[PDB]
Amino acid sequence: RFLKVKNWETDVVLTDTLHLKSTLETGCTEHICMGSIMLPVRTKDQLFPLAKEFLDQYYSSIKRFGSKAHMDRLEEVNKEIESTSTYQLKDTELIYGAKHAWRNASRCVGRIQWSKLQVFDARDCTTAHGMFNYICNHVKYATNKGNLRSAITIFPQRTDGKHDFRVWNSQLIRYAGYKQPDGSTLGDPANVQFTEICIQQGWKAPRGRFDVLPLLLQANGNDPELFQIPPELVLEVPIRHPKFDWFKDLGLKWYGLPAVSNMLLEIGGLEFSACPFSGWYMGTEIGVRDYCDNSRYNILEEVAKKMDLDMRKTSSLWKDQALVEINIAVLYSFQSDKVTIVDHHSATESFIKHMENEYRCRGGCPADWVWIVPPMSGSITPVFHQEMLNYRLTPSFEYQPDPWNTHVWKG
């Protein structure tokens, strides 16, 4: 079957055949679309088809399909499964899998970069201290003094689900959130619950607006352990505005390295429950969502108040006006400090080029419009006018429930 997408700004039409290789489900049916829904122990019965499919893909990509090398590997993986009820990926396979998980991440606008991922194999890791060391090296490598580099560090796969490796942090670097008795919040409200856990686990909280959280690391299903990232490794950027001198005095800064650490990497049926990865920021992640979401730092009012905007009626668009300057300031600051960042205009433009290239060479590019379109200035970016097909390919990054909701405490 053929599927056509259209760009209503340029009238370019692309044809999707890749969706036929789609395994997983969307959540949608013929009778309901769950396109805007945010979130819509494995036996051997189902493992070998998943392994075979991955290896068929792998050996196609290296143009060795049906080769003796291909067949032996299948045989090898096969025996290893029914002998051990799992199997191990070769280094080459792991690298391929991680890159393609990224390539398949339909909610990621940054995928033009997917082929240049630095994969750190941490499958020989056994303890939380080992995890901390690997993560430090990831952060140092990825940060690269502000010239950021995409990286992923992959810890050992799940076995019985009773020995999981997990990073309890949602990102490697994030600021603490503290709920005050008067109901207000100090720091990042998104992180209040995790902060509390850390504090409970023995973390001594500086209780400021921008405390970098400690890593909380779980190895081999053991109780997690606290570690402080060395501050010299945490690159941060003070936020100032190129024309507004009072903006510096708002006291804002942000960290340079976005490193998501709570997702699950699936490759050939194998589940890597700890696989922190990092790229670099799109400006709006910080300027729009982190600073201006009502449920986050929520600085729109103070900025608008300092701009002397008409804040009495919404139709003045004072919120809209302050939002733009804040995002200007975030971009200005990162660029002035020579820290890699991309504006939403450049990023969406690159993604369209990527997507078109993917249709030509791959026969498709699964893409989640709801997530690809930036949280401000939607229709003046080219992805707004781009029709997209969303479907799920493997290898993939998957959501997993927060570890504190499922962890069996040892003590």
Ligand X SMILES: C[C@H](O)[C@H](O)[C@H]1CNc2nc(N)[nH]c(=O)c2N1
Which residues carry a binding-site annotation for heme b? 108, 399
Of the candidate residues 3, 12, 28, 136, the single one contacting Zn ion (CB under 5 A): 28
User: What character string, x for contact with ligand X (CB under 6 A) and - otherwise, covers 217-246?
Assistant: ------------------------------
Residue 306 as a binder of a copy of itself (CB under 8 A): the answer is no
**For ligand HEM, which residue of 119, 237, 282, 355 counts as binding (CB under 6 A)?**
282
Decide whether 125 or 275 has the Cβ nearer to ligand 8J4: 275
* Residues forming a β-bridge with 29: 32
Distance (Å, whole) CA 49 – CA 42: 13
Residue 160 interacts with, from Zn ion, a copy of itself, ligand HEM, none (CB under 5-8 Å by kind): none
Stretch of residues binding Zn ion (CB under 5 A), selected from 28-36, 242-250, 302-310, 320-328: 28-36
Q: Binding string, 3-42, against ligand X, x = CB under 6 A?
A: -----x---------------------------x-x----
What 3-state DSSP class applies to 172?
A: coil
The smaller minimum CB distance to ligand X, of residues 250 and 367, is found at 367
Q: Where are the beta strands (DSSP E) in 199-289?
A: 215-218, 225-227, 236-238, 253-255, 259-260, 264-267, 270-272, 277-278, 281-282
Q: Which of 94, 342, 365, 383 binds ligand HEM (CB under 6 A)?
A: 342
Name the one range near ligand 8J4 by CB under 6 A: 122-130, 227-235, 280-288, 400-408: 280-288
Per CB under 6 A, the list member of 122, 131, 139, 152 interacting with ligand HEM is 152
Sequence-ordered list of residues with C-beta below 8 angstroms from that of 399, at least 6 positions apart, any chain: 39, 263, 264
Task: Indicate which residues carry an active-site annotation.
Answer: 108, 111, 280, 285
Burial category of 53 from C-beta neighbours within 10 Å (exposed 0-12, middle 13-18, buried 19 and up): middle
The residue (of 203 and 332) whose beta carbon lies closer to ligand HEM is 332
Q: Verify binding: residue 384, a copy of itself, rule CB under 8 A.
A: yes
CA angle 178, 182, 187 (to 5 degrees): 25
Report the alpha-carbon distance of residue 309 to residue 324 in Å, rounded. 13
Which one of 2, 30, 116, 245 is in contact with a copy of itself (CB under 8 A)? 30
The answer to the question of residue 40 lying near Zn ion (CB under 5 A) is: no
Which letter does DSSP use for residue 382 in this model? T
What single string gives the DSSP state of each residue in 279-292? --EEHHIIIIIIHH
Distance CA 370, CA 294 (A): 19
User: CA-CA-CA-CA torsion for 89, 94, 97, 103, nearest 10 degrees?
Assistant: 180
- Does 384 interact with ligand X (rule: CB under 6 A)? yes
- Quote the DSSP letter at residue 269: T
Alpha carbons within 13 A on the beta-carbon side of 218: 30
260, 307, 311, 324: residue in contact with ligand 8J4 (rule CB under 6 A): 260
Residues numbered 107 to 146 that lie near ligand HEM (CB under 6 A) are: 107-110, 113, 117
Residue pair 311/251 in contact by the 8 Å Cβ criterion: no
* Residues near ligand HEM (CB under 6 A): 102, 105, 107-110, 113, 117, 150, 152, 277, 279-280, 282, 285, 342, 347, 371, 397
